[model samples]
Every structure is written in structure tokens, then in C-alpha cells.
Target: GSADFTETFESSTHGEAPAEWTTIDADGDGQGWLCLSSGQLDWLTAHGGSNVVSSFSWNGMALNPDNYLISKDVTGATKVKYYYAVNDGFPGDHYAVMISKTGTNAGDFTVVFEETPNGINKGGARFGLSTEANGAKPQSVWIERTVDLPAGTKYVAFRHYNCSDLNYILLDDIQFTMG
Candidate 1:
């Protein structure tokens, strides 16, 4: 029997963050998470009707806006995998991927991935997202990574930490492979 589980975040709704995950605002100011790709910009948001841009969203949690996703608990997992990409750029955004097997309550368990200053080299191009018309997004690259889990791992979290006022992240194909 396999305990593998995968999440595309495609089943998640638009105009808001996926409901199953909880928001963790380190600044503790009520800021939230959003998974969107429904527009070319704020005004071009009517791109509905099955051709939606598809993704799980995060806004660098800007303005001391550090935010995180406390995913629904999973049981008996051995490893994990996911896909991540920056739409464009963010000068001060950083992130970390965490996991825990403690069960009841925990934070800051393991760090799987981290990007400091969101990949900007002290003063670099500010790419905010993939170009609506394509052929652009100076830093439009996709990253994929997998991390091993603790013996009894039961929960996982993606923490976009530190500072911001920057771009968004498109997270997809998150999966937990159990053994």
C-alpha cells in the first residue's frame, strides 16, 4: 500500500488562498496568502472560463508581510517534492520550506529551501511575474526540489519569510511520497 499524496493547488479556488491551508503571518498583522493567476493585471482579472493561469500564490508577504502556508497534516510520509517559480522578481523576499512530525503544535522544524533577498543581487532587475503575453519575465525560471522527511513526518509547511513589498510565487505540484 502506498501513502503517496500530491497537490497541484489547481483544485484550489481563485481570488483567495487555498482554504485548506492556514496563514501564518510572522508580523502578526493579519496579512494573508493568495493563490491567483486570474488576470493580466488588477484590471484584467476576468480571464475566467477554464483557461485560468493556474497556480498557488504568495505575495512575498510584503510590508514586513512575511506569510506562510501551514498545510493540512499528512500522516506517515517519507519524502516530499514540489515545483516553484517566481513570476518576475522581488528585491527583499526570502523563503523556507519546513516539516515536522511532532503532531499537535510546532513551527520551525526543517528548512528545505530558502532564497534570500528573493534572488535579486543587491540591486537587480525586478521581475514581478511571468509576462501575460509571454516571451518575457527577465527571471522567468521554474525550480523543482525534493527533501527527505523525518521518520514519522506528519506535517509540512512552506514559509516565505523575512521582508518584502515584492513579487509573487507560483507554487504547484506539491507532493508527499510515503514509504
Candidate 2:
């Protein structure tokens, strides 16, 4: 039998923070939090998702944002992990992970993990966040892509493209395991 490693946020109730996970406020004005709303979690589990997590949806207004890490240094090597899924709820937009030495509002580089199309439910695809649009997600899970990392970069930031109508994005088992 093949066993899959997983991390669940079930122990924590809705609108609460899970253990070992920290909520981040990207704007320095304390605007973001690791929201665990019941509806969000329920929707995640019902779907074919594993890492049921949530983050603030941004309206392309350049608001600073952040997310929590379920595991730190699981692979002993720093790398860019790409995550993608279908936003079947409503609206369509892309999701990305931003890394910065300073807080969320400071200078940083963004890596788009997934791009949700602007139509009906189209499954989902994973790929390295690239400016070139390679059309394929790289296989090296634990290696950092070209998205500029500071010397000894150890922290990560998060951001999203909130479809103008308050849409939500769903994420699951993000992989950083190197082959």
C-alpha cells in the first residue's frame, strides 16, 4: 500500500488558526489573517483537496498579504513549490506566492503557482512560476526557480488575484519533494 503524507487543519475550528501555522498581515497595518471559516474548510474537504487552507483574496489593488507554512525545511533544501487548483466556486483569477526579505509590502518577487482560467471549471495544472510561459510545470519540486532569492533566504510571503467579486481560491497538498 502506498501511503501519502498529509497535514490536516481539522483540529482547529472555523475562523481559528491551526497549530504551528501563523497568520500574516501583509500591509503592516494588520489586515490579513489565517482564516479557517467553516464554509471554507467544509468546501475544501468535500472537494478532492488535502491541504485545506485559505488566504485573503486581493483585488489587484497592490495590498500586502501573507500565508502560513504547514512545514518548514521538510526537504532540507530551499525551493519554489508550485500549487494549483480549480476555483469552481465563482469568478476566475490566478494565485501566486510572493517572497520578500522585508515585510509583505516591501520589494519582493512573485511566483504564480496556478492560473485559474476565466470560464467554466477546467481541472487544474501545476507549473513553475515563470515569466516565459513554458507551458509545463517543472519537475524539480525542491529547487528554487529563478524568482530572485536573497542570500540565505528563509522566509516566504503570499499573494492572490481576487476576482473582482470576492472569489476564493482553494489549495491542496503542495509539493516540494525533489526527485
Candidate 3:
């Protein structure tokens, strides 16, 4: 038998931090990652269920925000598939995916993919996502990505940053699987 980690965030209670994973607000600000229902936010729709996780970047914060969502360990997994999105109006809101083989911390992980205004950086290839045709208002469009991880990788982390005023980073439907 093989062990793998998968989550839809459906088991987590709405309007609270996810109970099954670690959410770190590295900047120590009160605002960090939280679980919510699709009905609760106008811009949210789950890729698989009614629940999703979100982090926000408010205007004029103390400094650049550094929020992290860490996943539980998986065994014999080569890739992690997940869904994500952002407020369509915010042009530069971004996040990165990282993997770790040791304890969980800032220093324990290495970047596998990161989103940039120019394009996405993953496996040394460049890609990008499309936004709503009209950016007049905040809209959320779910996009998915599957990131390859090194063999023997034990943990994965989503680092949300590049704060944009009131722009949010959304994530859902994560699965760790063997390739």
C-alpha cells in the first residue's frame, strides 16, 4: 500500500483556520489564512466543494505580508495537484509553492513554482494564467496546477505574498499523488 495526502478543505469548519493543517502568519499580523464557504464570499467558488482557503493583502500594511499554508506529509508522491485563483482586478498578487523533506519552517523548504506578473516559473519553464476580460470589479477565476516534487519529499507549503490592497489569494482541491 502507498500513502498520499489529499485535501479539499471540506472537512474544515467554515470561517476559521483549517484544523487539519498549519497556517503561519509570518508577519504576525492578525490577518492570515482562513477557511470559508463559497457563499460567504462573492469572489469564491470551490473547485470541488463548498469550502476553500483564502489569504488577504490589505492596503498600507506594516510591511510586505508573508503568509504560509503548510500541508501534511505524503509518502511516495511525485506530484501535487491543486487549484488556485485570485482577485481578478489585482494584477500582481502572487504566491509560490515549495517542498520540504525535513521539519516545517521557512528554512526547511525549497521553491518549486512561483507566480510572477511576467509569467509563472516552474521546472524552469514559463507559463501564465488568464484573467477576466473586464477587470473593473473583483472576480475570481479558478485555475489549476500540478507541481512535480522531488522524491522523498515529505511536506509542501504555499507561500502567499506580494500584497495588493484587499486582493485575496484562494486555494482548494489539493492532492498528493505518485507519478
Best by TM-score: 3
**lDDT of all the models against the reference?**
0.55, 0.38, 0.70
Q: Model 3, residue 50: displacement in angstroms?
A: 0.8
Please give me the total number of clashing residue pairs in predicted model 2.
2
How far off is model 3, as Cα RMSD? Answer: 7.2
Per-residue lDDT of candidate 3, residues 79-156 (tens digit): 988888765555355789988899788789889998842223112211111223232334556788999898878888
lDDT, model 1, position 133: 46
Q: Total clashing residue pairs per candidate? A: 10, 2, 0
Measured over all alpha carbons after superposition, the RMSD of each candidate to the real structure, in angstroms, is 5.6, 11.1, 7.2
Report the Cα lDDT for residue 6, model 3: 68
User: Which segments of model 2 are wrong by more than 4 Å?
Assistant: 1-12, 27-51, 56-75, 78-86, 100-153, 161-163
Candidate 2 C-alpha error for residue 59, in Å: 13
lDDT of 3 at 15: 73
lDDT (C-alpha) at residue 106 in model 2: 30
Any runs in candidate 1 off by more than 4 Å, and if so which? 39-62, 103-113, 117-138
lDDT string, candidate 1, 85-140, tens digits: 55444433456777766643435466655765345333333332333443333453
Q: After superposition, how far is residue 14 of candidate 3 from its true place, in Å?
A: 1.9
* Candidate that beats the other on TM-score, 1 or 2, i.e. the better one: 1
The lowest-lDDT stretch of 10 consecutive residues in candidate 1 is 43-52
